[PDB]
Amino acid sequence: PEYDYLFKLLLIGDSGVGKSCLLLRFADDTYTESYISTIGVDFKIRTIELDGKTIKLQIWDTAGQERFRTITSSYYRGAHGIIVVYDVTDQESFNNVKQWLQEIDRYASENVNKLLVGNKCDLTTKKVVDYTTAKEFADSLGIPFLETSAKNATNVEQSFMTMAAEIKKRM
Amino acid sequence: EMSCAEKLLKVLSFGLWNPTYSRSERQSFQELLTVLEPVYPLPNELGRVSARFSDGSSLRISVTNSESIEAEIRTPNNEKITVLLESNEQNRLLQSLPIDRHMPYIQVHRALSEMDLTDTTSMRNLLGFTSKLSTTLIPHNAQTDPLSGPTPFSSIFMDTCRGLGNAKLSLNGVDIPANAQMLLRDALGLKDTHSSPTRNVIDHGISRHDAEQIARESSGSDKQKAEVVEFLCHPEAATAICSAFYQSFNVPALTLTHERISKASEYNAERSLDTPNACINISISQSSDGNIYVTSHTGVLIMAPEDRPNEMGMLTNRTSYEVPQGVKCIIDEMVRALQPRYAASETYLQN
Ligand SMILES: Nc1nc2c(ncn2[C@@H]2O[C@H](COP(=O)(O)OP(=O)(O)O)[C@@H](O)[C@H]2O)c(=O)[nH]1
Ligand SMILES: [Mg+2]
């Protein structure tokens, strides 16, 4: 009885896009570059407050290189919420969002919660996926959307809060 | 007045895990053991190991595919004796060299010392030990084969940016500290995590000037520092360095163990244990014939099998491969040219 709800979260998306950095910013409000790549699955915990309710979040950060997909897909089925990340400077990462949603369709629970996040939104001079493009896509799917920056902290907290509210409502 | 190389050969022979060693003595062995370096093996060799000590003695162990083991000692005076060694259940000689073997089981070792697992330092320190011990080869199929699928090696340059400055790296037995690693990151043209190497480095390697600067900040002897510069000036050095960090090398081994790794991840997150997800320790060598061999290790925390609860260890995955001449630092060329073997072991603490 030290928390009111316990949600499992999963972070999927291409290698490179900032999944670990988002998680690190959410869990510790820090950003550095002293970390080697994620090998397999990483895990962190953060408790939040939402409508006077204490929510324990168990978040899993996957590796997104193609060869990891199989083992990684075994982590979908338990999740309450799945965040799909792409890099706003990397068109290929956004194109692949379509595949990541199929993996969700294939391996997630039928009524799992989704969120689309376009990370690195501080790289303005390099940005190649427009907000309106990504936002129209998330719309057609009825999925919430934000652009974020693990680096500046832009919208990182919103992202997880939003996901948590989404799950809270479902339950 | 006994040499470094002689000392190590005595230990390996009597047994690194021998119960009659005074623990303060196990200290000594570490310092010797970690000079050991995998290097390019000849055609009928399963593994070849080399150690060049600061007293100017060197040691060389060969292990034939038939597992016949010979050492060659060079005393500082440059005398050569060749010793024929035997591995058995008392010394566990073959368990205690950086070699991959065709065993029917993943090899288990016991970490020697109070090597705890609280933080970043202890973990690196663990991998620093395990990557001198043996590993058991694991086959892949098309699904787990790190070089098959639609995009083999897609992540290397990202993998290299994040790895350099956060790794233990050794070039011809010469330790390349974090500062020097950073210079290397620059010298390859990987200033930021999105770029590929410079067209120039891809074709001509690192400029002699960078190469020289990198070695000046690095540790080891002046003769050794010389081979490092000569090594980095090859186009192939770029290929060895970046390929060394490919994350998916680890898929065969995790395909076997990941649930137990995750279990350990959660055990640690539930206790505020600030442990990294993974650690890297690479050894790259170019023989006096110009042969380039890479040995890359990833260490990752792992729970003992169900029978021994709340106990924790490290899984070390070893990836070995020659970089043949003419193979340049491009994704497309790394794929159809490089041929890695994968091997793993599990090491458990003395807690
Ligand atoms: N400018 C900027 N760079 C970022 C941001 N997030 C991540 N990066 C960079 O991209 C690299 C990859 O991040 P990472 O979390 O390892 O991607 P992962 O493969 O999804 O875990 C990091 O080393 C960061 O340098 C961001 O919000 N802004
Ligand atoms: Mg990651």
Side-chain angles (χ1 to χ4, degrees):
Chain A
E2 70 272 16
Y3 55 82
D4 297 331
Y5 305 88
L6 205 217
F7 305 153
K8 298 177 196 158
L9 262 52
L10 195 67
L11 265 33
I12 71 174
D14 276 16
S15 150
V17 306
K19 300 186 301 298
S20 309
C21 288
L22 277 172
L23 183 56
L24 187 72
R25 174 60 85 173
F26 185 54
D28 296 319
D29 198 49
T30 42
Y31 171 94
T32 47
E33 289 171 308
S34 60
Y35 291 117
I36 71 142
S37 316
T38 300
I39 297 318
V41 186
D42 204 349
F43 178 81
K44 263 147 170 44
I45 289 168
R46 200 242 165 117
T47 308
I48 61 164
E49 292 281 302
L50 207 30
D51 323 59
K53 291 289 116 117
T54 302
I55 302 175
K56 198 203 186 169
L57 298 171
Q58 301 180 132
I59 320 167
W60 313 70
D61 168 22
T62 49
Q65 205 280 156
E66 189 279 342
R67 308 318 279 142
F68 275 114
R69 245 102 162 275
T70 304
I71 142 173
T72 252
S73 63
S74 78
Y75 295 81
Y76 286 38
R77 200 40 199 92
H80 285 107
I82 303 181
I83 299 162
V84 189
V85 192
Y86 70 92
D87 171 3
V88 302
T89 69
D90 181 307
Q91 180 63 53
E92 212 72 299
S93 72
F94 180 77
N95 296 329
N96 293 337
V97 173
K98 216 136 159 307
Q99 272 147 73
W100 292 121
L101 302 144
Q102 301 206 312
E103 302 288 303
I104 293 173
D105 280 352
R106 177 160 182 193
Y107 300 110
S109 110
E110 23 281 32
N111 42 25
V112 68
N113 267 139
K114 305 178 198 57
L115 182 86
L116 176 67
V117 159
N119 180 51
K120 295 192 200 160
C121 74
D122 49 280
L123 294 179
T124 59
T125 333
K126 256 67 198 147
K127 210 194 207 258
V128 307
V129 187
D130 294 38
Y131 174 99
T132 53
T133 330
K135 167 66 158 180
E136 253 297 27
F137 184 61
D139 282 350
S140 51
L141 297 187
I143 285 158
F145 175 56
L146 311 90
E147 315 191 311
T148 66
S149 157
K151 205 194 191 219
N152 302 339
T154 315
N155 279 359
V156 186
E157 194 139 284
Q158 252 78 27
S159 283
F160 293 87
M161 299 300 291
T162 300
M163 173 55 95
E166 222 57 33
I167 300 148
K168 201 187 148 291
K169 162 199 168 119
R170 219 169 85 228
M171 309 185 61
Chain B
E1 54 301 308
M2 202 181 276
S3 176
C4 272
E6 273 161 293
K7 260 144 145 215
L8 184 55
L9 192 61
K10 267 318 135 39
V11 176
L12 287 179
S13 233
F14 188 58
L16 173 79
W17 288 285
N18 204 292
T20 69
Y21 275 137
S22 102
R23 166 160 228 262
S24 94
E25 295 180 292
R26 306 246 220 250
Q27 259 191 53
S28 310
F29 310 157
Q30 308 293 55
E31 313 188 312
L32 309 189
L33 191 73
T34 58
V35 175
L36 241 35
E37 287 295 17
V39 294
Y40 176 73
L42 317 180
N44 75 318
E45 275 171 1
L46 163 47
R48 171 169 278 254
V49 169
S50 162
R52 298 188 281 186
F53 299 87
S54 66
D55 63 5
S57 58
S58 70
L59 182 65
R60 180 276 261 161
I61 298 146
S62 270
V63 181
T64 64
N65 297 300
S66 58
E67 300 205 339
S68 156
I69 316 145
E70 61 174 57
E72 169 164 323
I73 310 143
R74 294 204 166 273
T75 17
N77 57 175
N78 221 20
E79 152 170 285
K80 156 208 266 168
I81 43 275
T82 296
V83 170
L84 179 63
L85 301 159
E86 284 178 286
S87 182
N88 60 63
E89 277 163 344
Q90 292 80 242
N91 53 164
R92 309 168 70 95
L93 205 182
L94 242 21
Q95 283 68 49
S96 68
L97 302 169
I99 50 176
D100 307 321
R101 315 167 58 203
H102 296 289
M103 304 287 273
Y105 55 82
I106 298 306
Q107 182 103 67
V108 180
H109 305 112
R110 313 297 302 200
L112 334 130
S113 251
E114 111 119 24
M115 311 201 91
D116 195 86
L117 286 173
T118 304
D119 64 290
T120 331
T121 316
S122 35
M123 188 155 179
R124 290 150 177 281
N125 289 337
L126 187 43
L127 178 63
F129 173 59
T130 59
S131 70
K132 300 299 164 198
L133 309 184
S134 72
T135 51
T136 291
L137 291 143
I138 296 156
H140 52 76
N141 54 32
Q143 182 265 105
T144 62
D145 166 33
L147 272 64
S148 167
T151 56
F153 279 113
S154 79
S155 60
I156 16 150
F157 303 123
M158 256 295 189
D159 294 346
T160 303
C161 280
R162 284 171 303 190
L164 285 171
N166 308 309
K168 214 299 195 177
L169 173 60
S170 157
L171 302 177
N172 291 33
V174 168
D175 183 79
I176 313 308
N179 327 70
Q181 283 185 40
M182 294 297 179
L183 299 169
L184 190 50
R185 188 178 139 133
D186 283 352
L188 291 164
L190 305 179
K191 63 171 93 303
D192 73 311
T193 42
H194 311 145
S195 34
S196 299
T198 55
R199 189 61 251 177
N200 218 69
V201 156
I202 296 172
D203 289 311
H204 307 288
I206 315 307
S207 79
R208 162 158 264 97
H209 175 273
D210 312 348
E212 257 143 19
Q213 191 181 10
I214 289 160
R216 201 174 332 112
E217 283 295 6
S218 301
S219 300
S221 67
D222 296 291
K223 179 232 211 186
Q224 292 189 313
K225 293 193 187 180
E227 331 181 47
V228 167
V229 185
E230 273 320 306
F231 164 66
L232 300 158
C233 288
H234 290 35
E236 285 89 338
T239 305
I241 288 154
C242 306
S243 64
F245 292 91
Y246 183 32
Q247 62 187 269
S248 297
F249 283 169
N250 295 293
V251 166
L254 304 213
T255 292
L256 173 52
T257 47
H258 82 264
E259 286 175 49
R260 277 206 292 149
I261 290 147
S262 320
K263 262 311 279 255
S265 275
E266 306 176 35
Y267 189 78
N268 276 8
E270 286 275 338
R271 285 144 172 71
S272 309
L273 265 28
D274 200 284
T275 185
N277 151 83
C279 277
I280 313 211
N281 172 305
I282 295 148
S283 263
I284 299 175
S285 309
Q286 183 171 206
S287 49
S288 51
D289 296 67
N291 283 299
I292 295 173
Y293 211 62
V294 173
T295 316
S296 177
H297 306 78
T298 296
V300 133
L301 295 193
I302 199 177
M303 296 291 279
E306 307 246 297
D307 78 289
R308 296 153 51 211
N310 306 296
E311 248 247 48
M312 199 175 281
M314 173 171 298
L315 170 72
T316 303
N317 174 63
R318 209 204 311 281
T319 305
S320 333
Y321 56 97
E322 152 169 15
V323 167
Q325 259 229 282
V327 189
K328 293 181 171 176
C329 203
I330 97 185
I331 288 193
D332 295 359
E333 234 214 293
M334 268 161 34
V335 171
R336 70 97 163 99
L338 296 172
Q339 278 162 14
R341 296 173 314 178
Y342 314 89
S345 60
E346 272 172 32
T347 298
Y348 292 102
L349 299 168
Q350 214 67 318
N351 174 198

